[PDB]
Amino acid sequence: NTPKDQEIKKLVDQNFKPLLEKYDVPGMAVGVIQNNKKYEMYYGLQSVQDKKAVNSSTIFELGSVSKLFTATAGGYAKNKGKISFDDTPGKYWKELKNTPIDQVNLLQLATYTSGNLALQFPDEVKTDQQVLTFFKDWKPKNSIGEYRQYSNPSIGLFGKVVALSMNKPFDQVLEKTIFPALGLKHSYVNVPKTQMQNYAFGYNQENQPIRVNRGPLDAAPAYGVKSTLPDMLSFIHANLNPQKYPADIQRAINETHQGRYQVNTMYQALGWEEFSYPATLQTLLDSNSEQIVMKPNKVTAISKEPSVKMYHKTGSTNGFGTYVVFIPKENIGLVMLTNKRIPNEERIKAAYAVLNAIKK
Numbered sequence: 034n035t036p037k038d039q040e041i042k043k044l045v046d047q048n049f050k051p052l053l054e055k056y057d058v059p060g061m062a063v064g065v066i067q068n069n070k071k072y073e074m075y076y077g078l079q080s081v082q083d084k085k086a087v088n089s090s091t092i093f094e095l096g097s098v099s100k101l102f103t104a105t106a107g108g109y110a111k112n113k114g115k116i117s118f119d120d121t122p123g124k125y126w127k128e129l130k131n132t133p134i135d136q137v138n139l140l141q142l143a144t145y146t147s148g149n150l151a152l153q154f155p156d157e158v159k160t161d162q163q164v165l166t167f168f169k170d171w172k173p174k175n176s177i178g179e180y181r182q183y184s185n186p187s188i189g190l191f192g193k194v195v196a197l198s199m200n201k202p203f204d205q206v207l208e209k210t211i212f213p214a215l216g217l218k219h220s221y222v223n224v225p226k227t228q229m230q231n232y233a234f235g236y237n238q239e240n241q242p243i244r245v246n247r248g249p250l251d252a253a254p255a256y257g258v259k260s261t262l263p264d265m266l267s268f269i270h271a272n273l274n275p276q277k278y279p280a281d282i283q284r285a286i287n288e289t290h291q292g293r294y295q296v297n298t299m300y301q302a303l304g305w306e307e308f309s310y311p312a313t314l315q316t317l318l319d320s321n322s323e324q325i326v327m328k329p330n331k332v333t334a335i336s337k338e339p340s341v342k343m344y345h346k347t348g349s350t351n352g353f354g355t356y357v358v359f360i361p362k363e364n365i366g367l368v369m370l371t372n373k374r375i376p377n378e379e380r381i382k383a384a385y386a387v388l389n390a391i392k393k
């Protein structure tokens with residue numbers, strides 16, 4: 034009939050390719066891994082003005098999908114005995130001792146339940162001293178641990194503490210320890226001059242070329258990672274097959290898969306969002322609703338510990354969109370990278386359509 038690689042390509046053409054015209058997206062990379070076979074599909078241009086095609090070397094900004102690597106780094110440090118998730122940040126960043134934030138433990142930072150951390154650092158918070166001041170001036174609002182409010186400073190502080198516990202800067206933790214352990218060869222916190230020719234332009238909603246100029250250094254654990262489609266497929270492979278990796282990074286990956294609490298049908302793991310599988314489309318869309326992403330929500334203890342589960346994460350920057358999803362017992366995952374934002378719901382819907390139509 035039709036070879037499997039062509040069937041997958043046809044499904045990506047049917048569900049992802051129309052998004053390029055619908056949202057005026059210059060370039061897109063979509064990868065599927067099924068049963069340890071990788072399928073890569075590249076569309077469009079990484080630079081419109083250079084007429085340079087998206088390809089396996091194209092580097093994209095991951096946005097909030099960066100939090101998955103921070104989560105993995107925390108799991109690595111935990112299982113090396115360098116941190117406990119019950120520790121507080123003042124144990125490692127001593128200037129935070131005797132401050133309100135030092136009542137919040139590392140797990141609560143990593144899963145957004147400190148009770149009073151907003152979505153972004155304030156624009157004025159740019160230097161290391163302003164970040165220290167920001168956290169020193171933090172006072173609790175809600176009871177610690179009771180409410181989830183998605184927050185880049187929350188996981189930024191987590192990543193900074195993880196890096197302190199390993200005695201290296203966070204960029205070095207990823208680029209010298211975690212990325213190599215996962216087998217990634219073109220993933221970066223700082224893209225080197227030798228790779229600039231492969232770093233896609235991002236494109237804003239007027240289709241003007243832009244790129245993340247970021248904020249403070251301690252925001253990098255929240256959204257500072259750049260990667261290629263092959264590298265993100267390797268990362269999905271690692272999450273699908275942790276048993277194939279050395280003990281330290283295997284235990285780190287498994288740590289990121291552990292659900293910690295629920296908000297309705299979402300399980301909050303470390304970095305990853307987790308769902309009982311099969312998941313309804315609406316369950317996956319609800320995880321990205323304004324109510325969940327933008328408002329505080331009371332957390333509840335896990336009741337059903339799902340045996341059969343799936344995980345996903347969206348990420349965006351001003352000029353890039355990302356979506357990653359994987360389903361362990363179906364041995365399958367998908368990554369989408371674009372150099373223009375498109376609505377999260379469209380990313381989720383298109384991936385749902387593809388993954389559910391691929392023949393087992």
Ligand SMILES: *[B@@]([O])(OP([O])([O])=O)[C]([C][C])[N]S(=O)(=O)[C]C1=[C][C]=[C]C(C([O])=O)=[C]1
Pocket residue numbers: 095096097098152153185244245246247248256326347348349350351352
């Ligand atoms: B993350 O990407 O978002 P989700 O909703 O998990 O998909 C993150 C959190 C909202 N998005 S962000 O705050 O917009 C990342 C960001 C922050 C500051 C500056 C920039 C940029 O592009 O310059 C991006």
